[PDB]
Design a protein around this ligand. Structure first.
Ligand code: I3P
Length: 231
């Protein structure tokens, strides 16, 4: 589990999951969408934070594995593993410092779907993550993004919906994985391949969603990115 939720998905495979929330500060749960519904991750928003802050766990009853934190404004998020914030203790061993696993920037709509940018660490030819572990808040994923120093990173965006002449709607082909309209419905792709669906999220019921991820993402990145879409 601890291993699994941090491993990039296998080449050529789509890992399909079911994300549920309590029917505020609801809990969220992620399971593999197999007939043996194995539990992966859970998260919940902390009430006593100045900004949106979700703790993520590999124990659905409580194992702290990561955190989703928004900026003050609320339109930008960073995903961290379980390591220490360097600003809270400069003498801490570098290996114990938190890494940044993803960032999400949402465009703000006029007072519907929001356009999204997702930035993650780059991968080696070994197909493992090249970790980003800032020694202070003068570096990080959002920082590199705004500076446009994207060498060690991967940039992704939500795929624009297209006209479905059969359903008379602007939508995406979710392959039956998404059955209800929602501002949370999305596909995340790279510019180089609009058909390789890195992350798909969408509603199947009042409190249930599907979340399907592919390489280079792991389950923790996928889950946290999906959580950022709630609000
Ligand atoms: O306030 P508004 O303008 O009506 O926007 C909706 C509101 O946030 C609902 O709470 C939310 O449903 P949930 O509480 O179920 O998340 C819905 O998501 P939806 O598009 O998935 O229905 C939003 O579109």
């Amino acid at each position: 589990p601890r291993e699994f939720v941090l491993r990039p998905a296998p080449q050529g495979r789509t890992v399909r999951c079911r994300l549920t929330r309590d029917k505020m500060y609801p809990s969220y749960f992620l399971h593999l969408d197999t007939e043996k519904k194995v539990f992966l991750l859970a998260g919940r928003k902390r009430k006593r934070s100045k900004t949106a802050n979700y703790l993520i766990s590999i124990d659905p009853t409580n194992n702290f594995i990561g955190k989703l934190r928004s900026n003050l404004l609320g339109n930008r998020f960073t995903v961290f593993d379980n390591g220490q914030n360097p600003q809270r203790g400069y003498s801490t061993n570098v290996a114990s410092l938190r890494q940044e696993l993803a960032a999400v920037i949402y465009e703000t709509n006029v007072l519907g779907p929001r356009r999204m940018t997702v930035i993650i660490p780059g991968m080696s030819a070994e197909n493992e993550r090249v970790p980003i572990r800032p020694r202070n808040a003068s570096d990080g994923l959002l920082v590199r993004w705004q500076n446009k120093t994207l060498e060690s990173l991967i940039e992704l965006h939500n795929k624009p919906p297209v006209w479905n002449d059969d359903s008379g709607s602007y939508t995406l082909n979710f392959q039956g994985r998404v059955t209800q309209a929602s501002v949370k419905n999305f596909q995340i792709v790279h510019a180089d391949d609009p058909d390789y669906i890195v992350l798909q999220f969408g509603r199947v019921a009042e409190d249930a969603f599907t979340l399907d991820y592919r390489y280079p993402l792991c389950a923790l990145q996928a889950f946290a990115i999906a959580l950022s879409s709630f609000d």
